[PDB]
Design a protein around this ligand. Structure first.
Ligand SMILES: *[C@@H]1O[C@H](CO)[C@@H](O[C@@H]2O[C@H](CO)[C@@H](O[C@@H]3O[C@H](CO)[C@@H](O)[C@H](O)[C@@H]3O)[C@H](O)[C@H]2NC(C)=O)[C@H](O)[C@H]1NC(C)=O
Ligand SMILES: *[C@@H]1O[C@H](CO)[C@@H](O[C@@H]2O[C@H](CO)[C@@H](O)[C@H](O)[C@H]2NC(C)=O)[C@H](O)[C@H]1NC(C)=O
Ligand SMILES: *[C@@H]1O[C@H](CO)[C@@H](O)[C@H](O)[C@H]1NC(C)=O
Ligand SMILES: *[C@@H]1O[C@H](CO)[C@@H](O)[C@H](O)[C@H]1NC(C)=O
Ligand SMILES: *[C@@H]1O[C@H](CO)[C@@H](O)[C@H](O)[C@H]1NC(C)=O
Lengths: 154, 570, 485, 291
């Protein structure tokens, strides 16, 4: 299922976050400075909710037992949101190796994990600052994905 | 971007040479300013209209990577700064080939580290339009001290002299080296030969054949072969052995280490590394030595006399190899009779009628057969006293050595041609040699007997005497056990004093007797020691007067203390 | 007499306090004080027998002005007054002692006391330490640097107590408010504990090879003052013991911690007993005891099969289904090589550690849970002599001495198998005359290295050979000695 | 220097021995213009004449109640408070920090939009509290909850025990969200004997959750033995969209997520905690049964 992949990706993200916290003691990795990049499309915060938690209609891996017409919007939003995430981690991964700076290595854990999720579901100095703020928002995001997927699957 | 709190700029460049100066400006978007400086992300350095545009000068940048950040405490922005040097011109180029099947490998010295990402290029050029190029990236973790180009040119064409180049590129300044010339012959090191195996020929450990497989065009080979006896390893050369060699004149029954190296040409190629060591065992060789056999003549009866046979093999020229079987065989000289037996131990006994002479032979049967049958003629234990020499003498100047010197027999010294000496264990001595040096299987502080037989075909002479190597004063003396009076003579009888208290050979006894009321010197009698005696006589003393008796045991190097006391009133 | 030593000061932010001492009777005496403001307006207060007067910023006291104070004591038909004072309320403030449990660390004649203070400003730090026998002794901590504050003390050998206090100095290097009071006293235990002899019980083991240990309950007594209570500075927090079973180390290391004074079940092996006391620093001192290994007199059967590449030893266990551990330890050697396995037979690869001639201790332990020393049972630790026993069974240096005309004495040295207990059974000595018509054999107990040969015919040449015999195979004949008389 | 409440004035005074206070002018809210009697509660007698009176405030004697009066009739009255300042650092002396150097400690039981906030006062004589969402931007999340200065169980610290005052607040949103972007910000107004205080805090409600210990603890020896619990009813619905993770501790031990673990007793009590399975939020208090 997608579920084992979800736990694997959550665990490797936790490991990468703890390594970043250890290594980047003075970098902007604490304060939080939480500025998301998903302001353009926000249906993850809008469509990824339970049907018993739905009170007003104004605002594969899918099991046949839990079939809904509005969960597809949530899965499509997660799909596109993670494609934009994947595209920018390609950029930061390429940018973290061109210079001689090699104190921090980003293993392919989230990369291969989100790649497997995508194939399963359908079908200087500024750079590490950007990487840390993206991981800070990405932790809360990936908690949201795991929450909604664990809800929809079970 | 991420620096929404303003901007920072540096002058002149993000990359800087050592010891230069930098001008840093921190600015903020319209509507205190501190600078934090780091080394390897390590904090060792620390520091509204004016804050809108702050200009500062930073110098004395240490060698490495530095983090300089402008922070208002909310951070404003920052730049990462790297300092370094241009690479040094590399020195001591050295390129290596490995055998017929091996690409070009080579090594060079990159000198000191610039703490910056650099890359190195290796260039190979040579006649008949041969060239190659490769790159290696060097950083704080990876060092390009050696590289393999991955191209294996033909070693047959050894008539081209080639050029090697190495070049260094960094962000600061390019570096190069001299275009080193090299001779194709020098680069190649042939691989050591394999299939180095042993074949046994001629049924002897002194002979063998070595076989191996190696490049057929190799013209020179060298072999090291050594046992554990000496650290020096035996050297031998060979010109066009073609994978096979024959080894003659080897010392048998010995573990050997064998190694081999190659050389393709006398003026071309190079040596080879040592091959795998062969741990070989050398087979046995049948000995040709002659072993003496010793006999004792003890007379049970005139028709069933007992004859013993003793021998000892103590050298690996007559006891070489796994000896297990001893085929003993006796012949009778006067009448045609022989006896044969198999023995595994060194002592063997047999009952034979006393009449006639004998010839006793033994074999040394090892793994591949027996040695030559060693035989000794047997005569009477003692012959006439005409051939008996003068009393033999013995001297020990050393605690573990005895020299025995014999006078020639009173008749002549020409009839006998060999002397045998025993103490039992046996040695041989020619008559020409004046004395005999024996220093083995003897322990001081024990009385010994030494015997020499002059071996003759008709009647062999015999002589013997008792002595010891080293002796000291005896620990104690014997006791006066029994006293008797008869025929106006006093007989004193004792017991055999035990061995450990004499510590050697006892020479004589001195008995002191006196009257009980005399404090003067007691009168003394001298007794020469002999094994057979156990009682001693003494003349009549003064009647009706008590007498005190005691004794001491005196050797050459000491005297036993006074033993017991006896009071007698006759 | 009367009131004296007036002192008003600030207990806490939004708090103020004042105090003084009286000289005279405590019967029917009233105490009243005043304050006046030069804007004139005056305020007053009284508390009778109680001395602690508490006042703060919302009773109308002038606090940002040079406020003046006087006091009057009234008894009977008499009143008397003390000296007038005038000062600023904010300055001269009483600070706070180190609140909470101050942390302490130990070192070789060093005691480091670190704590946290609410007011970040540095203050003068002073302490007083007391012996159980003498009174207090004062000591200044000197200047420090500050988020926390630390102090140093020389570590006295026995337990001591100490109190800490402060006073807020001015920034001009001058004392401001008076001394803050001492905090709660803290006790330092001895850095080394003088340990006495605890008593243990010794007993022979049973047929099963089992031993019972009941450690006697005793604790030392520490001389501490009246105030040294509620803390491990008075006595040790807890005693403890550690048992180490160093005989079957195939599995993970299994050392067991036990509260002192309870029933434990031990086996007939070597053991390490460690009696320890956990103070506030941790492990202070140790009582060390060693338990030598023993073997039951009941020898049970063991079977062996060595040679080739497979060495296998067989027996009949009491019950299968539980893991066992087997040890093959060379007794004579320095035990450079330790050989054991964890698996009725056991088979393993042949290695040059068990094939030589010497004593091998074969140790069989039954186990089910490698966590407790109760369930290890000494099944058997037996002696083995590997290799060829005939060569080791050959006597060396057989010496025969004539005693009488018919009796002679044969003596020889002990072989290797004499130094392995329980294997040798007898010695065969052969008396044969050289004629071959008279041959006899005698059996000698292994504990005797000497025998007296009797029944000998005189004037007959004699050859003697000796052997040593084990329970399995006969020994080899020694070198014959040829003697007569 | 502003109206806290209608007719109520608050000023700030430099609390320092060697600098003067601030000058504030007061007027009587009455169309009649004539000499007037103004009196306070700390100072007896009228200190100023005229409808407009200047007052230099330097000390709490100058704070409090100021009544406008003439003859026998009270024309008006005014309230004056103080806001103390210590050398560039705002004075915070009505409340006390928790063990984590935090003045206000809030906690939510579940994601229902409701929570509580707790704080530690030193005394209880004439205090007043106010809790509001200090909202500047319109899209900031807002609360519409009431105010209680309600007393609670007297809790202790490294010294004598003190008073806990708490409120039960609740957030309201038009439509729910899968997660929260903007944090939750609260402002507290405190007052003791005319001592004015403003306190502020900000926090997410997803980093402060402490769930409840389980309700039904069954014990089935299975030979094996299994303890059974259940997630409390006091939680968001369903239990699948938001889940829990549990500790196990016998009398430093392991974590479990399934209800029945087969541990064996060693003569000691066994207990379980309650933690969310994603965040490093606060652990609850164990409710358990021995063996
Ligand atoms: C211990 O080492 C010996 C050395 O080979 C092993 O073989 C033994 O070899 C001796 C050789 O002298 C055998 O003695 C023989 O005895 C017969 C008895 O009639 C005699 O006729 C022969 O002339 C010879 O003296 C000995 O029997 C033989 N032992 C055995 C058991 O065959 C021996 O096997 C080794 N023992 C062990 C336990 O490994
Ligand atoms: C929160 O506290 C601050 C400072 O304690 C208050 O700030 C004052 O705000 C008033 C207007 O509300 C201004 O006239 C003052 O000048 C401010 N003080 C200073 C020193 O400049 C604030 O009012 C309090 N309340 C809120 C809701 O923010
Ligand atoms: C090498 O450096 C010199 C100046 O130092 C420059 O002119 C030249 O172009 C460089 N060559 C390469 C290949 O970088
Ligand atoms: C406290 O501060 C005031 C400031 O005017 C000063 O006069 C006084 O000396 C200080 N200390 C005392 C003793 O009150
Ligand atoms: C003081 O507070 C710090 C805060 O982390 C704490 O670690 C320390 O144990 C406290 N006590 C001291 C330093 O005595």
């Amino acid at each position: 299922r997608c579920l084992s992949q979800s736990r694997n990706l959550l665990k490797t993200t936790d490991d990468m976050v703890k390594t970043a916290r250890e290594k980047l003691k003075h970098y902007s990795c604490t304060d939080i400075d939480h500025e998301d990049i998903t302001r353009d499309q926000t249906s993850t915060l809008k469509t990824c909710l339970p049907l018993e938690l739905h009170k007003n209609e104004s605002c594969s891996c899918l099991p046949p037992q839990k079939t809904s017409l509005m969960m597809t919007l949530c899965l499509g939003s997660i799909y596109e949101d993670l494609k934009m995430y994947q595209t920018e981690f390609q950029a930061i991964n390429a940018a973290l190796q061109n210079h001689n700076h090699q104190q921090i290595i980003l293993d392919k854990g989230m990369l291969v994990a989100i790649d497997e999720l995508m194939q399963s579901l359908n079908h200087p100095y500024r750079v590490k600052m950007k990487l840390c703020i993206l991981l800070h928002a990405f932790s809360t995001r990936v908690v949201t994905i795991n929450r909604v997927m664990g809800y929809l699957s079970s | 971007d991420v620096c929404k709190l303003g901007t920072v700029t540096v002058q002149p460049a993000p990359v800087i040479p050592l010891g230069s100066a930098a001008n840093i400006s921190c600015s903020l978007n319209p509507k205190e300013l501190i600078l934090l400086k780091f080394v390897n992300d390590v904090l060792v350095e620390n520091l509204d209209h004016t804050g809108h545009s702050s200009t500062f000068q930073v110098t004395n940048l240490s060698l490495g990577m530095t983090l300089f950040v402008c922070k208002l405490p909310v951070p404003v922005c920052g730049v990462e700064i790297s300092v370094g040097v241009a690479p040094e011109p590399p020195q001591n180029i050295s390129c290596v080939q490995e055998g017929e099947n091996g690409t070009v490998a080579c090594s060079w010295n990159s000198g000191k580290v610039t703490y910056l990402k650099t890359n190195y290029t290796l260039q190979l050029s040579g006649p008949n339009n041969l060239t190659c190029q490769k790159q290696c990236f060097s950083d704080n973790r990876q060092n390009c001290n050696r590289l393999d180009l991955g191209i294996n040119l033909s070693p047959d064409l050894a008539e081209s002299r080639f050029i090697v180049r190495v070049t260094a590129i960094n962000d600061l300044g390019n570096s190069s080296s001299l275009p080193h010339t090299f001779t194709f012959l020098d680069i190649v090191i042939p691989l050591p030969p394999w299939d180095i195996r042993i074949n046994f020929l001629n049924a002897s450990g002194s002979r063998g054949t070595l076989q191996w497989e190696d490049e057929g065009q190799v013209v020179l080979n060298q072999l090291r072969y050594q046992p554990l006896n000496s650290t020096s390893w035996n050297m031998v050369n060979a010109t066009n052995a073609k994978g096979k060699y024959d080894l003659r004149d080897l010392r048998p029954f010995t573990e050997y280490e064998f190694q081999i190296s190659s050389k393709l040409h006398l003026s071309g190629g190079s040596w080879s590394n040592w091959s795998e060591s062969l741990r070989t065992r050398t087979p046995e060789e049948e000995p040709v030595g002659i072993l003496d056999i010793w006999y004792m003549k003890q007379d049970i009866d005139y028709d069933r006399q007992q004859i013993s046979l003793f021998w000892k093999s103590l050298n690996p020229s007559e006891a070489r190899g796994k000896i297990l079987h001893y085929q003993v065989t006796l012949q009778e000289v006067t009448k045609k009779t022989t006896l044969q037996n198999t023995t595994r131990h060194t002592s063997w006994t047999r009952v034979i009628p006393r009449t006639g002479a004998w010839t006793a032979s033994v074999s040394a049967a090892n793994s591949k057969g027996a040695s030559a049958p060693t035989h000794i003629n047997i005569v009477d234990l003692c012959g006439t006293g005409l051939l008996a020499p003068h009393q033999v003498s013995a001297k020990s100047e050393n605690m573990d050595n005895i020299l025995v010197t014999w006078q020639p027999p009173k008749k002549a010294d020409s009839a006998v041609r060999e002397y045998i000496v025993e103490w039992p264990h046996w040695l041989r001595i020619p008559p020409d040699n004046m004395s005999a040096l024996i220093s083995e299987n003897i322990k001081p502080y024990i009385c010994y007997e030494i015997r020499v037989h002059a071996l003759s075909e008709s009647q062999g002479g015999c002589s013997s005497i008792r002595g010891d190597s080293k002796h000291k004063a005896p620990v104690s003396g014997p006791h006066i056990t029994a006293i008797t009076e008869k025929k106006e003579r006093l007989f004193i009888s004792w017991t055999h004093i035990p061995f450990p208290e004499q510590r050697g050979c006892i020479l004589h006894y001195r008995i002191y007797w006196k009257e009980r009321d005399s404090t003067a010197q007691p009168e003394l009698c001298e007794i020469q020691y002999r094994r057979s005696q156990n009682s001693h006589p003494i003349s009549s003393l003064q009647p009706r007067v008590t007498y005190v008796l005691w004794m001491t045991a005196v050797t050459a190097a000491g005297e036993s203390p006074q033993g017991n006391e006896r009071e007698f009133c006759p | 007499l009367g009131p004296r030593n007036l002192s008003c000061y600030r207990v806490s932010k939004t708090d103020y306090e004042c105090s003084w001492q009286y000289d005279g009777p405590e019967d029917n005496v009233s105490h009243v004080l005043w304050c006046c403001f030069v804007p004139e307006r005056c305020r007053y207060f009284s508390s009778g027998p109680d001395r602690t007067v508490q006042f703060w910023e919302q009773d109308g006291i002038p606090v940002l002005s040079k406020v003046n104070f006087w006091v009057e004591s009234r008894l009977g038909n008499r009143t008397m007054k003390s000296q007038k004072i005038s000062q600023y309320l904010y300055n001269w403030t009483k600070t706070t002692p180190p609140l909470g449990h101050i942390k302490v660390s130990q070192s070789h004649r060093q005691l480091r006391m670190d704590w946290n203070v609410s007011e970040e400003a540095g203050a003068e730090v002073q302490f007083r330490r007391r012996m159980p026998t003498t009174n207090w002794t004062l000591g200044d901590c000197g200047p420090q640097v500050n988020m926390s504050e630390s102090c140093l003390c020389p570590s006295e050998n026995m337990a001591q107590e100490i109190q800490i206090r402060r006073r807020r100095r001015l920034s001009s290097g001058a004392p401001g408010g008076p001394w803050s009071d001492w905090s709660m006293p803290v006790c330092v235990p001895p850095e080394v504990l003088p340990q006495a002899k605890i008593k243990f019980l010794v007993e022979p083991l049973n047929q099963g090879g089992r031993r019972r240990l009941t450690m006697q309950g005793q604790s030392p007594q520490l001389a501490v003052p009246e105030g040294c209570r509620g803390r491990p500075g008075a006595q040790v927090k807890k005693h403890l013991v550690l048992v180490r079973m160093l005989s079957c180390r195939c599995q993970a290391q299994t050392s067991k911690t036990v509260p002192l004074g309870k029933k434990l079940n031990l086996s007939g092996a070597t053991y390490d007993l460690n009696v320890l006391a956990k103070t506030r620093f941790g492990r202070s001192t140790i009582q060390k005891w060693h338990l030598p290994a023993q073997e039951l007199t009941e020898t049970r059967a063991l079977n062996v099969s060595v040679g080739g590449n497979m060495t296998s030893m067989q027996w009949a266990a009491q019950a299968p289904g539980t893991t066992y551990c087997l040890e093959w330890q060379p007794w004579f050697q320095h035990r450079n090589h330790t050989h054991c396995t964890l698996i009725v037979t056991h088979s393993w690869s042949s290695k040059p550690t068990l094939e030589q001639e010497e004593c091998y201790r074969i140790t069989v332990f039954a186990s089910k849970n490698p966590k407790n020393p109760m369930l290890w049972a000494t099944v058997l630790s037996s002696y083995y002599f590997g290799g060829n026993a005939s060569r080791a069974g050959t006597p060396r240096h057989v010496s025969v001495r004539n005693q009488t005309g018919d009796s002679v004495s044969v003596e020889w040295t002990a072989s290797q198998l004499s130094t392995c207990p329980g294997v040798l059974t007898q010695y065969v000595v052969r008396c044969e005359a050289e004629d071959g018509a008279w041959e006899s054999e005698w059996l000698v107990p292994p504990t005797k290295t000497q025998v007296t040969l009797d029944g000998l015919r005189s004037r007959v040449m004699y050859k003697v050979q000796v052997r040593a015999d084990t329970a399995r195979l006969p020994g080899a004949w020694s070198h014959p000695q040829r003697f007569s008389f | 220097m502003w109206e806290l409440e209608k007719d109520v004035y608050v000023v700030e005074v430099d609390w320092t021995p060697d600098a003067p206070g601030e000058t504030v002018n007061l007027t009587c809210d009455t169309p009649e213009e004539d000499d007037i009697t103004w009196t306070s509660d700390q100072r007896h007698g009228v200190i100023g004449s005229g409808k407009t009176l200047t007052i230099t405030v330097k000390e709490f004697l100058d704070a409090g109640q100021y009544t406008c009066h003439k003859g026998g009739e009270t024309l008006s009255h005014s309230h004056l408070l103080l806001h103390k300042k210590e050398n560039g650092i705002w004075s915070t002396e009505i409340l006390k920090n928790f063990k984590n150097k935090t003045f206000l400690k809030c906690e939510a039981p579940n994601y229902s939009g409701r929570f509580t906030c707790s704080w530690l006062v030193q005394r209880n004589m004439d205090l007043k509290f106010n809790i509001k969402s200090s909202s500047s931007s319109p899209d900031s999340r807002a609360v519409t909850c009431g105010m209680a200065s309600l007393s609670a169980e007297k809790v202790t610290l490294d010294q004598r025990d003190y008073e806990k005052y708490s409120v039960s607040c609740q957030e309201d949103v038009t439509c729910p969200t899968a997660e929260e972007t903007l944090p939750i910000e609260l402002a507290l107004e405190a007052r003791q004997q005319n001592k004015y205080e403003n306190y502020s805090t900000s926090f997410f409600i997803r980093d402060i959750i402490k769930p409840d210990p389980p309700k039904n603890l069954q014990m089935k020896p299975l030979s094996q033995v299994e303890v059974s619990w259940e997630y409390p009813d006091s939680w968001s619905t369903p239990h699948s969209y938001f889940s829990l993770k549990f500790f196990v501790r016998i009398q430093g031990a392991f974590l479990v997520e399934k209800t029945s673990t087969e541990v064996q007793c060693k003569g000691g009590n066994v207990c379980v905690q309650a933690q969310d399975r994603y965040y490093n939020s606060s652990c609850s208090k164990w409710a358990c049964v021995p063996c």
